[PDB]
Design a binder for this molecule. Structure first.
Ligand code: HEC
Lengths: 55, 431
């Protein structure tokens, strides 16, 4: 709270954190794409897809 | 040199080369592989190999006569070579081989042995000769469901159904009078050949080969014969080319000549004046390629075949080759055109004026079957000299710039991408 109830410091730090955390989400998305790219997507059959790949 | 021609229903066309030491005399029919339905396919190959059969070649070799044959898409040929004093013997042998009888060639034992031999040769071609079977599948998918798609060699599934009745039916429908040109090349005179044909009778048949219902039409497609147990990746790729009797015949051949051919292991082949080599030699993208301008009676093909071991960079090979093809439409220089003029004069004079008379007989027979008379080489050099850069740019805009392509490949062609990126690479997006 930065105080004793939801007050001016609470809303100001919620705005600062709310501006901040989407860039952490963008960094986690880049890490997500890396962990995807090391094995490629799945397919709706549940078998390998190494045979017929299209770009 | 000079090419004469006369007629009596048959067509007699010669090339008296008095400097040569042999004399080829033979008949060149106007039927080919493009005149077969897909169920009697390979009957021309089987006529080639019963004409080159063991008994027939033995009877030929008793008098000192070597046989030769050729099966193309448009034309067959049956050429008999001999010494220049034995043209009468060669004509009488060709008469006895085709005209006077065919049942002794078409006996049961000779036909079964020849069918066994051609079945062996077609299987050996199918599983061992890779760039040629790539080019045959390129024809089979560029012109599909259309009689120019049929391979000259025949297929294993059709050729094991042929019997003697189909051989005789093809003979009655295609070995005819108007369909044929009797050709004498080498050291024979024209008047001697005409007087010796008129001395005999040599009348093949009444005439009129069947007319094909469907004309050849290009169809952009692909076929992928992926075999991972092969050491290389063979791939042909072509657009709709120019047929013969076209005004853009020599322009299409000079466009093929601009990018030439290449062999990565020969030292003098790596130093050619092609701007594709600066892109292709850095990471060793291919072992060889050749640009071909194939021209048939109804249609044609223009493209390149190649082979490579760098199987992870096939798309870069196709990419740089097709960007060089796009340079023809936009910005081909004058020096590349002059270089292609000189090299095409060189290889065309090697092709038409080599020392071998049977190749002259095949070429003259094909040309006077299609266009009625042989264009001599001096007028061909004048037509090559008449080509400018604007002619090449107009032809490339007509035939190359953003047109459908046909692709065939075998081997380790997984590195070859989809059809759409190869198709979309035909136009640069920067012009
Ligand atoms: C907790 C589950 C989960 C969340 C949340 C999630 N992802 Fe994924 N994502 C996956 C999985 C699992 C795959 C792999 C798909 C599969 O099974 O093949 C994937 C794959 C992808 C792909 C590749 C394309 C695709 O459809 O697979 C992209 C892009 C992607 N995620 C982006 C995102 C983005 C952007 C977010 C949010 C910013 C996100 N993901 C959140 C689980 C998730």
């Amino acid at each position: 709270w930065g105080g004793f109830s939801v007050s001016n410091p609470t809303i100001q730090r919620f705005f600062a954190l709310h501006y901040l955390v989407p860039f952490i989400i963008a960094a986690m998305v880049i890490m997500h794409l890396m962990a995807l790219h090391i094995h490629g997507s799945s397919n709706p059959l549940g078998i390998t897809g190494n045979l017929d790949r299209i770009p | 040199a000079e090419v004469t021609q006369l007629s009596n229903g048959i067509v007699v066309a010669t090339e008296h080369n008095p400097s040569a030491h042999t004399a080829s005399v033979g008949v060149v029919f106007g039927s080919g592989a493009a005149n077969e339905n897909p169920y009697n396919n390979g009957v021309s190959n089987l006529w080639k190999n019963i004409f080159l059969s063991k008994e027939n070649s033995a009877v030929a070799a008793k008098e000192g006569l070597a046989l030769s044959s050729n099966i193309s898409r448009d034309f067959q040929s049956y050429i008999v070579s001999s010494l220049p004093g034995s043209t009468d013997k060669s004509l009488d042998f060709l008469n006895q081989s085709f005209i006077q009888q065919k049942a002794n060639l078409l006996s049961s034992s000779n036909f079964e042995a020849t069918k066994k031999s051609v079945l062996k040769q077609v299987q050996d071609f199918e599983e061992n000769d890779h760039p040629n079977r790539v080019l045959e599948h390129l024809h089979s998918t560029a012109f599909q469901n259309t009689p120019l798609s049929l391979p000259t060699r025949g297929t294993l599934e059709s050729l094991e159904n042929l019997v003697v009745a189909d051989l005789e039916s093809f003979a009655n429908n295609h070995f005819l009078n108007s369909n044929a040109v009797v050709v004498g090349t080498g050291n024979i005179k024209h008047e001697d050949l005409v007087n010796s044909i008129e001395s005999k009778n040599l009348s093949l048949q009444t005439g009129t080969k069947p007319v094909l219902k469907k004309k050849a039409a290009f169809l952009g497609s692909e076929v992928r014969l992926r075999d991972d147990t092969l050491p290389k990746a063979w791939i042909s790729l072509a657009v709709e080319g120019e047929p013969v009797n076209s005004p853009n015949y020599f322009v299409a051949k000079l466009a093929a000549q601009i990018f030439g051919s290449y062999n990565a292991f020969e030292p003098a082949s790596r130093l050619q004046g092609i701007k594709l080599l600066d892109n292709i030699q850095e990471y060793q993208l291919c072992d060889n390629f050749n640009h071909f301008s194939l021209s048939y009676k109804d249609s044609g093909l223009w493209g390149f075949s190649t082979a490579t071991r760098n199987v992870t960079m096939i798309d870069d090979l196709i990419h740089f080759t097709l960007k060089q093809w796009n340079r023809l439409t936009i910005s081909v220089t004058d020096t590349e055109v002059e270089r292609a003029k000189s090299l095409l004069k060189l290889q065309l004079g090697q092709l038409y004026e080599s020392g071998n008379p049977v190749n002259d007989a095949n070429l003259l027979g094909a040309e006077v079957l299609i266009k009625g008379s042989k264009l001599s080489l001096g007028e061909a050099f004048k037509k090559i000299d008449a080509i400018t850069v604007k002619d090449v740019k107009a032809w490339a805009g007509k035939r190359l710039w953003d047109q459908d392509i046909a692709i065939a490949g075998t081997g380790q062609i997984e590195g070859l991408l989809d059809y759409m990126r190869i198709r979309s690479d035909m136009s640069m997006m920067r012009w």
